[PDB]
Amino acid sequence: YQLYRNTTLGNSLQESLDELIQSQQITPQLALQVLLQFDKAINAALAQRVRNRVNFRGSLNTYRFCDNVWTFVLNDVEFREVTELIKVDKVKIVACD
Amino acid sequence: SGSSGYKFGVLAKIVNYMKTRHQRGDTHPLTLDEILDETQHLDIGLKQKQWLMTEALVNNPKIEVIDGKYAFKPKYNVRDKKALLRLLDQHDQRGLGGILLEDIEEALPNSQKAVKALGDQILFVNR
Amino acid sequence: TNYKPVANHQYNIEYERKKKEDGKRARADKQHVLDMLFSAFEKHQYYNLKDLVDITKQPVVYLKEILKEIGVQNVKGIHKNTWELKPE
Amino acid sequence: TVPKLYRSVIEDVINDVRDIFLDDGVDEQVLMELKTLWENKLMQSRAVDGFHSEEEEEPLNSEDDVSDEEGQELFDTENVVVCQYDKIHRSKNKWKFHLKDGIMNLNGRDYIFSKAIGDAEW
Amino acid sequence: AQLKFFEQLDQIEKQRKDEQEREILMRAAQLRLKQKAKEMQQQELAQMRQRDANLTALAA
Amino acid sequence: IVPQLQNIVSTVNLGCKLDLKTIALRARNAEYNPKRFAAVIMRIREPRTTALIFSSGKMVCTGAKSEEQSRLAARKYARVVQKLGFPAKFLDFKIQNMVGSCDVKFPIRLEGLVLTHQQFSSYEPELFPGLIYRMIKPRIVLLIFVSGKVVLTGAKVRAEIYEAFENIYPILKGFRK
């Protein structure tokens, strides 16, 4: 899943690559191969990552489901994980199966 | 498995598209680079690009190629859906084996032409 | 000798497998199959309709239209509906 | 436990693409430039600390209205949550979400869950 | 151009001998074939990933 | 007792071919999953309704609790497609089925009804705890329970729901516990 490319981690990577492409320091096609490999590595890393059990709640707005991927947008929603609680009035949720 | 370049089906696909877009009334000679360009598949790799150009469009049966640009080989006559009075008056081969293989792929499924073809001398039958 | 089971155990296992996948898929950007179909057709000149189905989950009738659009079926000599890319 | 995962992933990815760079004809110096360029952007952003950084039948539309602003949905700074869904349920307007493996950024902070459960009315 | 096309004719004999050496170990009894099979297995997943990526791009 | 209508299933033809994928991506509150079903499910909050918008241009609207509410909700669903830009027409807003519910307010003996009315009434305890009294003169299927819930489903017009309940009221009054 080329899901995690538009994340801090993934975007900083693409930007770095574009520069190298720009300066012909680094070029495309190879860039695609890196994204494939970078994306595969991040997916494997996440699979061997794992975390902790939490508890939560929300209030709905838009939803979309295509390519087995759900994309929601909640308003006035606060989510608490373990001790920490985070308030929010606009949150976008992208979820793969 | 012999020699393979990039993704399989580039040939059986380039020819077919070229055929398709030409029938769609975009009629004009083109080159493999022009097809790549228009299909946004230019990044097929120079090696494959070259192998397609030199060989794929060379093993091509009777490729009608005046020079630079590849053209339509099977149908000698332009698919103009009209006026085959030359073949009707060609009374030297009993109608010249009018085949339907090169028909029904135009705007009117032979039928529209045939009705006028029915209206005219043109006669339709099937074996 | 005779018990009172409601849903036969074998039937319930089959029902669970069915609910997992539904064939009624959509068909947009239909040209991509041809990428996959030709893909396979280069490795072997011809493939039994069943082998092509094992790749395209779309309806056979509609798949046959896609197969008929870009190719022809040869008996190859032992029945076994088999499709091949046109040599032109 | 998050900067750690990122280091972990960056290391693995960098190590795993070295041969590809080499096969493509690339000096190992370029690889190091990548790592540097990459590590540096995060430090510049300052979202967290890193080890590297420290270094009628026709008038249908006549009624009008009824739909709200589509543009409200996108801010580009909106708290973005990436997660994996196990089961999404809907009864009338009652929705229940069963999520997993998620990275959240709420109010500016970063959080991670292995399993999330939520409720919302539409 | 054709000096390297005669070397490409020798590259055709390279693959000929690669197949010969494959059946050579077979007669004296496939890694390339296994690699090809693995590559073939990869493409369905690649198409699914590309569709997911397009949805994520448009979605966010 | 007056039965309350609480659902209208209606079909309205938009008149033109619609591309379903385009509608799903731009319309809000829309889900179009091809594998499970072949139509876009679209839901609006102001009048609680859900319209399955089909590709052939035929739209079915459900969940409305009165006749005027259903016509208005269908007019609003067609406004969505009009705004996106597909050519849009409104034709034949025809109600297909209306389900109504009421309480007789007295306990009823289902077993007795089956004894004197076996011809029109079918009751099996294991399958369905309610007796179904399919009625021929006004075509309606009424599901009756011991509590007293007369559940009339299958009336194309408002009058039929009321007429059937008045017709079945004497039979229940006779078997009143």
Swiss-Prot record, chain A:
Annotated Gene3D superfamilies: Transcription factor IIA (TFIIA), beta-barrel domain (2.30.18.10), Transcription factor IIA gamma subunit, alpha-helical domain (1.10.287.190)
Its job: TFIIA is a component of the transcription machinery of RNA polymerase II and plays an important role in transcriptional activation. TFIIA in a complex with TBP mediates transcriptional activity.
Listed GO biological process terms: positive regulation of transcription by RNA polymerase II; positive regulation of transcription initiation by RNA polymerase II; RNA polymerase II preinitiation complex assembly; transcription by RNA polymerase II; transcription initiation at RNA polymerase II promoter
Organism: Homo sapiens (Human)
Chief location category: nucleus
Keyword Nucleus among UniProt keywords: yes
PANTHER family in alphabetical order: TRANSCRIPTION INITIATION FACTOR IIA SUBUNIT 2 (PTHR10966)
Gene: GTF2A2
Nucleus listed as a keyword: yes
Cellular compartments annotated: Nucleus
Record's protein name: Transcription initiation factor IIA subunit 2
From Swiss-Prot, chain B:
Highest taxon above the source species: Eukaryota
Signal peptide location: none
Record PTM N6-acetyllysine, positions in chain: K7
DNA-binding region(s) from the entry: 1-79
Outcome of substituting A83P: In TTD6; reduction in the levels of both TFIIE-alpha and TFIIE-beta subunits of the TFIIE complex in patient cells; reduced phosphorylation of TFIIE-alpha observed in patient cells
Disease link: Trichothiodystrophy 6, non-photosensitive: A form of trichothiodystrophy, a disease characterized by sulfur-deficient brittle hair and multisystem variable abnormalities. The spectrum of clinical features varies from mild disease with only hair involvement to severe disease with cutaneous, neurologic and profound developmental defects. Ichthyosis, intellectual and developmental disabilities, decreased fertility, abnormal characteristics at birth, ocular abnormalities, short stature, and infections are common manifestations.
Function: Recruits TFIIH to the initiation complex and stimulates the RNA polymerase II C-terminal domain kinase and DNA-dependent ATPase activities of TFIIH. Both TFIIH and TFIIE are required for promoter clearance by RNA polymerase.
Protein name: Transcription initiation factor IIE subunit beta
Source organism of the structure: Homo sapiens
Name of the encoding gene: GTF2E2
Shown segment, full-protein numbering: 68 to 194 of 291
Swiss-Prot record, chain C:
Binding-site residues, DNA: G77, H79
Localization: Nucleus
Family: Belongs to the TFIIF beta subunit family.
Functional summary from the UniProt entry: TFIIF is a general transcription initiation factor that binds to RNA polymerase II and helps to recruit it to the initiation complex in collaboration with TFIIB.
Subunit structure of this chain's protein: Heterodimer of an alpha and a beta subunit. Interacts with HTATSF1 and GPBP1. Interacts with URI1. Interacts with GTF2B (via N-terminus); this interaction is inhibited in presence of GTF2F1.
Protein name as annotated: General transcription factor IIF subunit 2
UniProt gene name: GTF2F2
Part of the whole protein covered: 151 to 238 of 249
From Swiss-Prot, chain F:
Tissue specificity annotation: Widely expressed, with levels highest in the testis and ovary.
GO MF annotation terms: aryl hydrocarbon receptor binding; core promoter sequence-specific DNA binding; DNA-binding transcription factor binding; enzyme binding; RNA polymerase I core promoter sequence-specific DNA binding; RNA polymerase II cis-regulatory region sequence-specific DNA binding; RNA polymerase II core promoter sequence-specific DNA binding; RNA polymerase II general transcription initiation factor activity
Keyword list, A-Z: Disease variant, DNA-binding, Host-virus interaction, Neurodegeneration, Nucleus, Repeat, Spinocerebellar ataxia, Transcription, Transcription regulation
Extent of the Sequence repeats: 5-81, 95-172
Annotated residues for binding of DNA: N7, R43, K58, N97, R134
GO terms for biological process, alphabetical: DNA-templated transcription initiation; mRNA transcription by RNA polymerase II; positive regulation of transcription initiation by RNA polymerase II; RNA polymerase II preinitiation complex assembly; spermatogenesis; transcription by RNA polymerase II; transcription by RNA polymerase III; transcription initiation at RNA polymerase II promoter
Cellular localization per UniProt: Nucleus
A GO cellular component annotation in the UniProt record: male pronucleus
Family the UniProt entry places it in: Belongs to the TBP family.
Name of this protein: TATA-box-binding protein
Organism: Homo sapiens (Human)
Gene: TBP
